[PDB]
Amino acid sequence: MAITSKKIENFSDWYTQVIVKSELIEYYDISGCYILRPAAYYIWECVQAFFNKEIKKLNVENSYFPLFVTKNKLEKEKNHGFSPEVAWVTKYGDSNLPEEIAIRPTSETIMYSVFPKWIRSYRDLPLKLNQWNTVVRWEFKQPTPFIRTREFLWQEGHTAHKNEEEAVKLVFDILDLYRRWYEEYLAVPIIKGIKSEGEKFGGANFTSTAEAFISENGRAIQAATSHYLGTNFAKMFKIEFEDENEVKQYVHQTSWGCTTRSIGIMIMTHGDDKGLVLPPNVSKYKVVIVPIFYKTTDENAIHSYCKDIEKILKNAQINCVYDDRASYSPGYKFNHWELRGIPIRIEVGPKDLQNNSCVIVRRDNNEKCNVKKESVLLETQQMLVDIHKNLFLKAKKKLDDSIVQVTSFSEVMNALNKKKMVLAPWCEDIATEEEIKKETQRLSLNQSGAMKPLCIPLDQPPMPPNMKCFWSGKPAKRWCLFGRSY
Amino acid sequence: MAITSKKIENFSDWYTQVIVKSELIEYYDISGCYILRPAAYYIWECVQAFFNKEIKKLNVENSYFPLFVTKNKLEFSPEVAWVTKYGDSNLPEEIAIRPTSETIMYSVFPKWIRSYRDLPLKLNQWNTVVRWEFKQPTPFIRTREFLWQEGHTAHKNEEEAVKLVFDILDLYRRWYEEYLAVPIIKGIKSEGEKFGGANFTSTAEAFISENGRAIQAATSHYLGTNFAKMFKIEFEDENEVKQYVHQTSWGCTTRSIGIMIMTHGDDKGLVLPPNVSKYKVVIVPIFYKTTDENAIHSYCKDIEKILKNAQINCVYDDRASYSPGYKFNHWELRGIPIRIEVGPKDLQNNSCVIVRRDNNEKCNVKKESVLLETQQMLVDIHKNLFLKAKKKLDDSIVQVTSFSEVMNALNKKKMVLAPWCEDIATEEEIKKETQRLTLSGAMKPLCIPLDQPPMPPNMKCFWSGKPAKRWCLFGRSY
Numbered sequence: 006m007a008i009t010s011k012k013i014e015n016f017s018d019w020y021t022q023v024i025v026k027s028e029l030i031e032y033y034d035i036s037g038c039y040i041l042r043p044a045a046y047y048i049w050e051c052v053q054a055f056f057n058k059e060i061k062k063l064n065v066e067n068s069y070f071p072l073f074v075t076k077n078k079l080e081k082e083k084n085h086g087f088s089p090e091v092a093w094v095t096k097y098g099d100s101n102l103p104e105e106i107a108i109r110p111t112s113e114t115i116m117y118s119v120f121p122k123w124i125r126s127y128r129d130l131p132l133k134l135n136q137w138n139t140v141v142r143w144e145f146k147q148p149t150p151f152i153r154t155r156e157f158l159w160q161e162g163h164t165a166h167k168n169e170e171e172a173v174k175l176v177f178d179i180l181d182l183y184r185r186w187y188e189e190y191l192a193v194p195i196i197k198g199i200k201s202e203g204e205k206f207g208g209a210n211f212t213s214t215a216e217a218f219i220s221e222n223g224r225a226i227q228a229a230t231s232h233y234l235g236t237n238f239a240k241m242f243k244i245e246f247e248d249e250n251e252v253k254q255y256v257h258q259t260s261w262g263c264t265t266r267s268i269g270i271m272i273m274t275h276g277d278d279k280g281l282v283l284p285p286n287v288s289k290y291k292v293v294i295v296p297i298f299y300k301t302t303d304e305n306a307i308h309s310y311c312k313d314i315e316k317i318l319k320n321a322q323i324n325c326v327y328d329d330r331a332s333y334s335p336g337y338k339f340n341h342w343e344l345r346g347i348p349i350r351i352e353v354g355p356k357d358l359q360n361n362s363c364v365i366v367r368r369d370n371n372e373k374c375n376v377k378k379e380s381v382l383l384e385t386q387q388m389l390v391d392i393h394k395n396l397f398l399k400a401k402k403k404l405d406d407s408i409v410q411v412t413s414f415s416e417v418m419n420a421l422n423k424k425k426m427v428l429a430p431w432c433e434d435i436a437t438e439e440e441i442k443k444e445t446q447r448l449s450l451n452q453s454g455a456m457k458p459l460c461i462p463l464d465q466p467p468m469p470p471n472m473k474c475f476w477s478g479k480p481a482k483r484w485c486l487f488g489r490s491y
Numbered sequence: 492m493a494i495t496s497k498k499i500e501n502f503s504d505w506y507t508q509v510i511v512k513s514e515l516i517e518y519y520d521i522s523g524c525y526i527l528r529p530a531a532y533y534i535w536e537c538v539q540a541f542f543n544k545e546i547k548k549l550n551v552e553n554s555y556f557p558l559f560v561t562k563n564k565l566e567f568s569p570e571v572a573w574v575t576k577y578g579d580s581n582l583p584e585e586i587a588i589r590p591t592s593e594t595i596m597y598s599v600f601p602k603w604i605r606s607y608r609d610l611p612l613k614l615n616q617w618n619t620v621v622r623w624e625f626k627q628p629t630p631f632i633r634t635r636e637f638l639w640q641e642g643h644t645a646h647k648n649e650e651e652a653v654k655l656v657f658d659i660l661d662l663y664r665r666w667y668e669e670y671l672a673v674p675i676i677k678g679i680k681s682e683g684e685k686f687g688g689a690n691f692t693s694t695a696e697a698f699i700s701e702n703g704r705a706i707q708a709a710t711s712h713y714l715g716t717n718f719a720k721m722f723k724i725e726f727e728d729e730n731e732v733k734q735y736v737h738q739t740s741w742g743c744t745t746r747s748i749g750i751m752i753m754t755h756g757d758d759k760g761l762v763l764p765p766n767v768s769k770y771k772v773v774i775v776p777i778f779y780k781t782t783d784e785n786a787i788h789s790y791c792k793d794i795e796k797i798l799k800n801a802q803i804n805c806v807y808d809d810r811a812s813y814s815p816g817y818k819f820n821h822w823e824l825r826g827i828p829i830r831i832e833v834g835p836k837d838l839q840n841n842s843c844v845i846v847r848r849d850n851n852e853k854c855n856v857k858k859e860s861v862l863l864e865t866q867q868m869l870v871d872i873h874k875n876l877f878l879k880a881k882k883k884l885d886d887s888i889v890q891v892t893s894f895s896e897v898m899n900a901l902n903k904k905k906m907v908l909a910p911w912c913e914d915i916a917t918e919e920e921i922k923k924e925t926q927r928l929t930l931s932g933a934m935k936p937l938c939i940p941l942d943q944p945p946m947p948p949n950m951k952c953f954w955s956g957k958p959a960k961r962w963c964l965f966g967r968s969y
């Protein structure tokens with residue numbers, strides 16, 4: 006088992022190979038659904054634990070609402086173009102249901118229908134809820150393991166506040182928790198930003214977003230969402246509270262979500278030609294121990310040594326595996342565990358046993374270092390930190406190198422052709438969005454190739470005071486990130 | 492609000508009132524589906540964190556398998572929900588929502604298991620399933636959708652598998668007893684009540700005194716090679732000989748929450764084992780003057796700090812809209828284990844008043860020691876709840892030798908322990924005759940308990956008169 010396609014040459018097939026052979030997923034006889042094996046789900050558990058800790062600090066309470074929602078309830082607020090993606094239960098056994106029932110594609114209509122019962126006065130606020138659940142969307146866009154799946158795991162938070170300031174504050178708090186969840190657990194850098202009027206969630210006042218970029222195929226991917234919903238849903242669902250004068254006021258809402266797409270983003274960011282590369286924080290085993298016998302008499306000495314090292318790491322709660330299987334060569338094992346993304350390999354040969362040393366090898370850059378057994382615990386600890394740092398830094402470099410700043414449309418296509426995004430001064434007129442889509446599609450016929458507004462970044466470079474929009478020529482308001490996406 | 496029906500007098504309405512007014516659930520416009528509000532879901536998270544910790548000591552690895560299973564792979568029948576449409580178009584073939592995941596997982600087990608080095612395979616899922624139940628649903632107890640976990644393992648032999656079966660069963664015991672303060676009885680299902688694909692089903696049974704109802708609390712099966720043969724799950728042993736795997740499966744649902752409520756709830760509302768209550772303590776201030784307000788606020792906050800510094804989550808109810816009485820009632824209703832009242836008189840003593848939820852005992856405590864006496868109290872409450880429940884379980888069993896004795900016992904809201912021949916045949920006979928004489932009156936074999944009383948040398952079966960093999964538990968259920 007080896008990775009047959011190179012990441013830069015054939016990214017799609019490299020991806021499918023990596024995720025199957027590293028034992029993250031199995032494919033399934035229902036298109037767009039994938040089995041999450043222990044190695045994948047472990048990553049989900051880690052980020053889940055982190056995120057739970059941090060939102061409980063914000064006093065968000067977990068909850069669980071039904072998987073099913075009635076047609077009447079799901080469809081109450083007009084359509085507001087999701088309808089072909091709804092999966093419908095039409096019967097139980099061989100008996101038709103009087104009315105069909107939908108599986109949740111998200112929980113707005115389920116939760117907000119009961120919010121008025123729970124919110125009567127200003128004394129009931131804020132209301133802060135989260136769910137860890139599964140949803141179903143029958144994606145017609147190309148399904149891709151983790152990135153776009155028809156059933157996926159995720160978290161949805163919904164809150165309601167007495168005013169705008171408090172809700173918006175929470176929207177950005179959540180957003181930085183997403184930043185930390187990418188950075189600290191997946192070693193993935195993201196760009197924070199505000200979605201254009203064309204790209205935001207229809208029900209939202211504004212949509213803030215974390216964007217990632219896969220440099221290897223030049224594609225941006227939305228990494229997480231955090232919305233200021235204002236009073237839009239409060240009006241739709243009649244969610245009001247009597248204020249301190251017993252005057253009825255609309256709540257100010259937020260919602261926010263992040264999915265197993267994250268695992269996908271992480272795989273694509275750090276994976277190399279040898280396979281999966283895991284940040285230590287989301288790998289079950291931090292270290293693999295591999296014995297080496299240069300045709301040596303005593304297997305048992307080396308075995309006992311290896312065992313000692315394993316006990317040292319395990320006792321320090323650094324989980325590890327000792328691969329003592331007789332039926333595979335050391336080289337086989339090196340490759341096998343590289344493919345599975347074990348952050349550190351420790352090799353023990355006969356020479357090492359004589360010197361009370363061992364050889365430590367980093368998954369990320371393949372650097373080796375002979376070190377004394379009695380120092381392995383401190384070395385390992387530090388190395389697991391270094392690895393994370395390295396991964397993050399490398400990813401950040403690629404991210405920063407993927408942003409070409411431009412001032413006129415004339416520079417754009419070149420940039421797109423080099424698998425980059427563009428940062429451009431933009432008038433933000435809603436009409437220009439589809440225009441820019443159409444033109445970049447058309448011009449891509451020569452080189453979907455359309456580029457779209459990814460986000461208005463929080464980190465704006467200086468805007469020269471007479472600067473014009475790259476596209477319309479009108480006055481430019483802010484810098485916007487554009488690029489091709491998933 | 493308060494509880495309008497008494498537990499002993501009208502159990503159903505009491506239960507409905509308690510779950511809604513203590514803010515555990517909201518009813519929903521699809522029958523048998525219930526919203527889990529933060530207080531119920533918190534309970535679920537606690538027992539989940541515990542179970543995860545323990546199965547992870549057994550090298551069980553969590554995973555997630557799809558909600559959907561194809562018609563082919565799936566093939567009880569009318570209980571499955573079918574998705575047949577996306578938007579306005581029909582799926583070319585209908586897909587089911589999982590009622591359980593045996594066919595989803597065991598289909599892929601052959602690919603993952605090649606040799607004894609791949610064994611044991613130990614997987615768990617925290618997920619949801621849907622079963623379209625015929626019976627009227629009961630919040631937590633029997634719901635159309637429920638959360639649960641499913642564990643599935645495959646071992647190289649019978650011995651290892653069976654040992655895992657009972658390790659898991661004990662973990663369920665601890666789930667109920669150390670976290671929900673509910674006593675259970677370990678037993679083995681009769682040959683008609685067991686899981687069909689199983690070699691044997693082990694089970695934990697609970698009982699509700701007040702309505703005389705037995706509830707299956709959790710399951711742990713030895714599956715032997717049944718599924719290994721039907722699904723072709725084989726491993727190369729250490730001599731390169733192919734052998735069938737020996738499998739196990741086990742599960743426990745949000746029903747456990749129900750079992751706890753019913754067990755500990757009283758006529759003031761919810762009663763919670765301290766470890767599954769978000770707030771262990773509510774601190775309530777008591778005023779006379781506007782002058783007192785500051786000194787009592789500070790003091791209160793001080794207590795708060797102490798508790799929270801010792802990782803004891805608590806709520807200071809400094810609301811002015813409400814009287815201390817209303818507060819007491821409100822937080823008792825929501826099942827907070829401890830109430831610390833702080834008044835002026837207490838303030839002059841550097842003391843306060845601590846009040847227990849389970850038995851309403853009050854006592855004065857000096858600020859300096861509040862921490863230590865709260866910790867102890869939280870232990871004591873759990874213990875008291877468990878012990879009391881245990882008594883009520885023990886007094887719920889009536890040992891009989893002939894069917895002559897059964898019926899009075901049943902009608903006293905009891906279950907019977909009887910010597911039985913374990914003839915599958917006798918199982919529906921007994922049920923047809925027990926109800927002849929919104930829930931059924933029939934009684935069924937609950938479990939053949941692991942702790943067997945001695946069987947007198949030639950004792951006859953309480954029903955068929957044939958020789959008795961073992962002592963079995965019989966009773967009414969949901």
Ligand SMILES: Nc1ncnc2c1ncn2[C@@H]1O[C@H](COP(=O)(O)OP(=O)(O)NP(=O)(O)O)[C@@H](O)[C@H]1O
Pocket residue numbers: 111142144151152153154155157206227228229230262263264265266
């Ligand atoms: N099918 C999917 N599988 C996995 N993750 C998804 C899927 N659809 C959306 N997400 C992610 O879920 C988060 C919440 O997304 P949401 O607001 O529901 O996205 P959306 O409106 O559907 N945008 P789109 O990706 O174009 O479908 C986003 O950060 C997406 O990255």
Ligand SMILES: Nc1ncnc2c1ncn2[C@@H]1O[C@H](COP(=O)(O)OP(=O)(O)NP(=O)(O)O)[C@@H](O)[C@H]1O
Pocket residue numbers: 591622624631632633634635637686706707708709710742743744745746
């Ligand atoms: N509808 C339900 N809601 C909640 N818990 C349930 C439900 N059905 C079964 N359980 C519990 O889930 C656990 C696993 O049992 P399982 O084998 O899945 O069902 P079961 O034994 O067939 N129960 P039943 O269908 O009522 O005869 C047991 O503790 C059951 O009591």
Ligand SMILES: O=C(C[C@H]1NCCC[C@@H]1O)Cn1cnc2cc(Br)c(Cl)cc2c1=O
Pocket residue numbers: 087088089090091110111112113142160161162206230260261262263
């Ligand atoms: O799901 C959303 C908005 C937000 N819901 C809570 C978590 C964070 C998330 O961004 C946008 N969205 C995305 N896909 C959908 C698909 C269908 Br089908 C429906 Cl009915 C509705 C939707 C839908 O509302």
Ligand SMILES: O=C(C[C@H]1NCCC[C@@H]1O)Cn1cnc2cc(Br)c(Cl)cc2c1=O
Pocket residue numbers: 567568570571590591592593622640641642686710740741742743
């Ligand atoms: O669900 C089971 C057996 C075990 N599955 C894994 C966890 C523990 C549990 O006891 C029994 N069971 C109960 N109800 C079912 C309903 C339907 Br519909 C189907 Cl198809 C199958 C079943 C079914 O197999």
Ligand SMILES: [Mg+2]
Pocket residue numbers: none
């Ligand atoms: Mg979408």
Ligand SMILES: [Mg+2]
Pocket residue numbers: 622
């Ligand atoms: Mg059933």
